[PDB]
Amino acid sequence: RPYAGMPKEVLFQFSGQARYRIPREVLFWLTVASVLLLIAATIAIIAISPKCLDWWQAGPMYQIYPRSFRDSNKDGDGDLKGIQDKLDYITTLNIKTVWITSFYKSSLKDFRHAVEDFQEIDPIFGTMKDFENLVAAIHDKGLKLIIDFIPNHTSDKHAWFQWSRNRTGKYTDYYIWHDCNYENGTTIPPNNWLSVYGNSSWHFDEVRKQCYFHQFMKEQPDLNFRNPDVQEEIKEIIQFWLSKGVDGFSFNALQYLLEAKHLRDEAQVNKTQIPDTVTHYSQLHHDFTTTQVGMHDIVRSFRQTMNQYSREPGRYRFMGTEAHGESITETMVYYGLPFIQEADFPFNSYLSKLDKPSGNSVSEVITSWLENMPEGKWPNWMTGGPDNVRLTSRLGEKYVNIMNMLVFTLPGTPITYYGEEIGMRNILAANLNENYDTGTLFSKSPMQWDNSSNAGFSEGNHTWLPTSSDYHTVNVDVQKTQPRSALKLYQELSLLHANELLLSRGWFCYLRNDNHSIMYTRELDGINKVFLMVLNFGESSLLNLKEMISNIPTRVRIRLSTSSAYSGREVDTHAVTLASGEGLILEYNTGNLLHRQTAFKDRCFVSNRACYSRVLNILYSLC
Amino acid sequence: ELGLFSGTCIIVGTIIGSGIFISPKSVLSNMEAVGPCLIIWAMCGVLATLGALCFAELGTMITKSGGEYPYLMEAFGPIPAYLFSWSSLFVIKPSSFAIICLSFSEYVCAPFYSGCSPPQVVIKTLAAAAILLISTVNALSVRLGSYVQNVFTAAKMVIVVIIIISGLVLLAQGNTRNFENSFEGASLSVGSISLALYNGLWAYDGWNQLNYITEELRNPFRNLPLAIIIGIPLVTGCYILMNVSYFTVMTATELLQSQAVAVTFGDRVLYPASWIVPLFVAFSTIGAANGSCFTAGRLVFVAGREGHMLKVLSYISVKRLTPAPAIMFHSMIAIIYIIPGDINSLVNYFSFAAWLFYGLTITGLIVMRFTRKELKRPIKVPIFIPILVTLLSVFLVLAPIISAPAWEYLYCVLFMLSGLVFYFLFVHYKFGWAQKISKPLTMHLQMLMEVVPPE
Ligand SMILES: CCCCCCCC/C=C\CCCCCCCC(=O)O[C@H](COC(=O)CCCCCCCCCCCCCCC)COP(=O)([O-])OCC[N+](C)(C)C
Ligand SMILES: *[C@@H]1O[C@H](CO)[C@@H](O[C@@H]2O[C@H](CO)[C@@H](O)[C@H](O)[C@H]2NC(C)=O)[C@H](O)[C@H]1NC(C)=O
Ligand SMILES: *[C@@H]1O[C@H](CO)[C@@H](O[C@@H]2O[C@H](CO)[C@@H](O)[C@H](O)[C@H]2NC(C)=O)[C@H](O)[C@H]1NC(C)=O
Ligand SMILES: CC(C)CCC[C@@H](C)[C@H]1CC[C@H]2[C@@H]3CC=C4C[C@@H](O)CC[C@]4(C)[C@H]3CC[C@]12C
Ligand SMILES: CC(C)CCC[C@@H](C)[C@H]1CC[C@H]2[C@@H]3CC=C4C[C@@H](O)CC[C@]4(C)[C@H]3CC[C@]12C
Ligand SMILES: *[C@@H]1O[C@H](CO)[C@@H](O)[C@H](O)[C@H]1NC(C)=O
Ligand SMILES: *[C@@H]1O[C@H](CO)[C@@H](O)[C@H](O)[C@H]1NC(C)=O
Ligand SMILES: *[C@@H]1O[C@H](CO)[C@@H](O)[C@H](O)[C@H]1NC(C)=O
Ligand SMILES: *[C@@H]1O[C@H](CO)[C@@H](O)[C@H](O)[C@H]1NC(C)=O
Ligand SMILES: [Ca+2]
């Protein structure tokens, strides 16, 4: 009856019900149930997957002082052509963002600035086409470029001010003017307001016959941000630089934007002081010249102008601000509100203030930023800047390595100042014939590249600033051959921080710490492996980790060390020793994570919680 | 009957598929410069014309129903004809179905993962759900096969002109910075040039299945070599005029970042409605997959006569006249392909096996024309075009394996030789016990799946 070759009519007898009927519909309904259970499973994975980290959260920034990086045409001043030559050195550090401080056409290159044209490059840095070739060379390497912006004041040689003193057109109110009595060279100002660098904050103008306001030196009149004409000018400069491909800005001197309209006198710190000897900025309470009422809606307006360019995916424009030196709760307002967006993060300069390497001095900065921060925000850690003594001269050479391991294992974005990866130091003296701030000038020495004329920075006769004397031992060429150098460790940390998935979005549980030592772990849920960083800022120690963590085995592997002697050597948890500036990245496996317990819910921090799935190999935010 | 203008309109719509949306990323990651990767689309675009012209010769002189299986039977004997029927059932046809459905989930899930790459589990769970749905619809019905075809080839051409017009208008506005200093980092090598011809030629897949149109052509012999030498060279001109429209908008460093190249383009140029590109490309890519599943039952019928492939595969279901055993076996092999590999490791695996049989065919063209066969051939091609296609394909099959060896080639060579083993132990020797494993298998399958021999 089978007779394998079977036309229509015969097999309809067999295929009716006997046994082969129920498999047909049960297999046909299986493939249908699965098709709508795979398009249902992919929707359930796209929904629970958390947003990936932007380019400003993913990798370290690298702050360059453009006049001291690399000189191309032997004139003694670095320029934008020399920054472009060294872009292949910057990508061996695994840098993601190159932050170039201000290069606009300036009449004063310090004291926070004096710009003559917000849309030109200063001649000593190159020309407008040298910038477009650098922005192209940066994007082709996969890097991003953010630049300094300071919108509070201009130079008194700016075209806007030359028209304003002439009362020309609409420019008569671009600046803050007021009437003042001027006889025999001595002026009485409209009030007792002081400059930030210390003197009467009003200055008489001979052409206008009025006084103009300036927070900084007399060469920097303050723009009047209360009239809408000035805000549309600052809106076109933000639009001019974003069209050239700049990936974001760093706004400076933001608390000085607005001032009180009533122009009433401040309150003295020492009330019983004679009102003609108050000439120091610190002798007044500054309630009418900093952080006025409508100041945050101006900064939120800059953020909307930058949103017209950050819509296409992969080209988000970063906005960061500098922090208020005195307050930390005033700094956290720049993070914005859950419904009004603002700076992506304000720059944390509190690590750059430590002058003595103590364990509780560093521990206080870490917990002060992380607990004061809003919920789903992103931290950042900046251990140096152009305006403070370099790390090797502030703390000592023994703390260069322990300090790079600190900011690369903490949550958030580490921001590096040029020359901090090789352990540069301040110069001892210089003779400059320009108007520079001699208190903060010695941390801008030219970059030391190798053993040559001027450390390989200029190839010319002279440099704008003398290089440090000991550039024969500390420079890039020597340090990238040595096996255990500050540059070699820096390239190991930025690579470990880049591709770990545990350092970028793992929890941060800050275990207890006595003075002279800091311990914290980074852990994710489905990873089944935790990092433990033990950093010793003290004299020396032999500390038993089995009592402290209560989660650690008795034999752990050293993933990294600052003295680099412990490349892969395993140690005993009972007795680990740390030699006064030693840091270890211990790494072990465990199923009991510290943030899941109840005693540690008060001291674990994460920005956007996300657990890990081993079977799917994805992050998912549902857990 | 269909005229010459329609004589090309069928072939041009046939060539342009989902290859132009996925290959640019892969051909550029091997040329490294905008300049050379523009000559690859022309070099492989010309090499696809000489291929389709040589196939016009065999298509007219042999004049048999089989697609390419006859051409190897007429020249070399029964072993290459079988070896091709073996690979075109386990290698060429299933993997080309897995690349089209792997490239449809790259475009559906790319917008929901803006800024970064989606996980591998999402672009495989969505591809496995497209293979099962495309192979189930084409088994339950035939009208629904051709119901949505003419609309799916509209969306395919609507986008092709939107990308071109936009990429030309932007070129008038002077956005010339990308190809100003081309050729500067060109890594020309037998390693890169071969691996970049694979991905460039995959966008031309569909030039061999172009001989069926002669039956309705008004004047076939006079117009078909014309409809080919003006149809495909019109398409390669529409590829370099579409790959140029990518580099006008974005740079060579941002191309390699995204797998969905046209999605990166619609965000940069068409912001008010940028969802149009991932929506229209998902239409055309799922339409080109519908064309692959339709032809699965074609070759198994012609090879089912000569007792090379199992005859049960050509059986048709009675309730719906659809080759159910051919389809559900054609897709079940594809599911096993999307699991291990991804698009780039499958375009190499596919264009490797496909190009050795593409060579053996057009060598059989001259070999039959040189010595063995003296029958009349209606249209004749010059002698210099076939010797080029074979000397090119011998470079395409043999350079990648020696210069850039990979584990994908090994599994490809082990598949054909495994079929060579099935030749002697199953069809060449005709063992006694070999029969009693076949007969109870076919009708039980017929019993379970209610399918019936076609005629
Ligand atoms: C033929 C046409 C096919 C479709 C074409 C394309 C269609 C779309 C075209 C175009 C996209 C339109 C614009 C979208 C903009 C972004 C919107 C967005 O992110 O919304 C999310 C909605 O939340 C969700 O859960 C979205 C789920 C999406 C599921 C997709 C379909 C899968 C199956 C397709 C059919 C397969 C059929 C196979 C058989 C034929 C936001 O949610 P969230 O929680 O805020 O963010 C979560 C995700 N991140 C951002 C964190 C990463
Ligand atoms: C305000 O400006 C006056 C200048 O008019 C400063 O006084 C001079 O300070 C320098 C310091 O290097 C002395 O050498 C001069 O002798 C001072 N001039 C006179 C007339 O005494 C004054 O210090 C400024 N106030 C500050 C900085 O708080
Ligand atoms: C605040 O400044 C006043 C001066 O304006 C200080 O008072 C005394 O001032 C007279 C002025 O002739 C001095 O001779 C005294 O020596 C001052 N007393 C002191 C220094 O104790 C007052 O003390 C100042 N207060 C603070 C807190 O510094
Ligand atoms: C037809 C009926 C009876 C059975 C259908 C089973 C199908 C839906 C199952 C069987 C094996 C499965 C695959 C197994 C493993 C993987 C790899 C993973 O990284 C993505 C999903 C993927 C690719 C699965 C997709 C769904 C799948 C193809
Ligand atoms: C079959 C095709 C022509 C149908 C689509 C027609 C419309 C929607 C298309 C055809 C050409 C297109 C234009 C081509 C180029 C540009 C320049 C670009 O900087 C902005 C979009 C813009 C202005 C496009 C807008 C949409 C457009 C007008
Ligand atoms: C200001 O007015 C004076 C007097 O006429 C003139 O010489 C000068 O050029 C003017 N400057 C500007 C900037 O208008
Ligand atoms: C005039 O100038 C002299 C300068 O020595 C000064 O002493 C005097 O107070 C001034 N007079 C007025 C009224 O400003
Ligand atoms: C500087 O480094 C070079 C290696 O590039 C070395 O040859 C030279 O001796 C060094 N000079 C000094 C003074 O150490
Ligand atoms: C530096 O001094 C030497 C000494 O002759 C001179 O040749 C050279 O030109 C000087 N450098 C510059 C930049 O002028
Ligand atoms: Ca101001």
UniProtKB/TrEMBL annotation, chain A:
Gene Ontology cellular component terms for the protein in this record:
apical plasma membrane
Q: Where in the cell is it found?
A: Apical cell membrane
**Protein name per Swiss-Prot or TrEMBL:** Amino acid transporter heavy chain SLC3A1
Q: Which domain of life is it from?
A: Eukaryota
- Domain spans labelled Glycosyl hydrolase family 13 catalytic: 63-488
Q: Which GO terms describe its biological process?
A: amino acid transport; carbohydrate metabolic process
Q: How does it assemble?
A: Disulfide-linked heterodimer composed of the catalytic light subunit SLC7A9 and the heavy subunit SLC3A1. The heterodimer is the minimal functional unit. Assembles in non-covalently linked heterotetramers (dimers of heterodimers) and higher order oligomers; the oligomerization is mediated by SLC3A1 likely to prevent degradation in the endoplasmic reticulum and facilitate heteromer trafficking to the plasma membrane. Disulfide-linked heterodimer composed of the catalytic light subunit SLC7A13 and the heavy subunit SLC3A1.
Q: Name the residues that span the membrane.
A: 26-48
Topology of the protein relative to the lipid bilayer: Single-pass type II membrane protein
